[PDB]
Amino acid sequence: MCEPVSIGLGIMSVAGATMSASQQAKAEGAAIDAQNRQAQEMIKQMNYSDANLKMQERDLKEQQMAELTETTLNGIRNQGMVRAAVAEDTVKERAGITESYNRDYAAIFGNRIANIENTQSAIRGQGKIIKTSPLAHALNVA
Amino acid sequence: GEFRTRQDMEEYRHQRLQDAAKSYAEEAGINPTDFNDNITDRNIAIYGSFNKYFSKQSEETAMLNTRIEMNSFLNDGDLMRSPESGKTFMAYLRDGLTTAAIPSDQRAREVITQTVRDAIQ
Amino acid sequence: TRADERSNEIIRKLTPQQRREAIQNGTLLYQDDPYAMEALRVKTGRNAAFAVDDEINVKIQN
């Protein structure tokens, strides 16, 4: 319990929601940062191709890898590469969004704006990438 | 859903950013003074995600108010025993619909279906 | 004061069924319609006052 990053769990358990945002941020980020650093250091040692390792290292890497996964904002990351694959602002320039990052109903209802511009490539863009459903796709192949 | 106000999310995000910058700069041996690539396309997503949740919370509170009012109405005895009962309910429903209040018509269908089940005990 | 006033004027010029369907499809609106908030305040005040007064009255009859 004397450990510097272990007492944070205790103070979280005892004090609780009466604390402000910054203190919760510190007490919850310490452990995550430590775990991430350990994971990186441990992954950085082994090889890449899984046909060149022993079974213990294979299972260890499989178990340890999941701590680094990302699931939500993949589209924004991958947007860059598709641009070069196919080819070869300051918010105000966007339509439907005010400077305060809120929707502009006046333009939406008057100018008849078809689409709201979240990211780039909303302006023009013939790449498509249209949303589909996993279950219908799975039923297609079978 | 963990926060209740925009300012709390602002402060939490700022502190996590400040910690993560040094925590990641330390590993590579790189001096932190030497991360702002797509700031707009992430701000937009965060703000949309917050606004949707706030709207959902507000409409649910409105539904709670309507539920309390219906329960208060339904417990009077002589009004139900009186030969003028359904007309009051219909007038109340029409007044509620014609002033925003009840958001959509699905909610109206739900409340109409539930009141029949309530008026049995 | 707020810069969202223009949103308020264009919002106000809508038939109630238009607002109802706009909320139903979920595309636009809900936090900027100047009626729901009034509904919440008025009904909250009524509920609180009536609950307190009923409790005191039944306690007196006890």
Binding site: T72, A122 | - | T27
Partner: peptide, 17 residues
């Protein structure tokens, strides 16, 4: 309980009068 989250859309399609 909690459920799986939802990825942020690239664009939204709306309607009018």
């Amino acid at each position: 309980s909690v459920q799986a989250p939802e990825p942020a859309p690239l664009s939204e399609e709306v309607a009018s009068v």
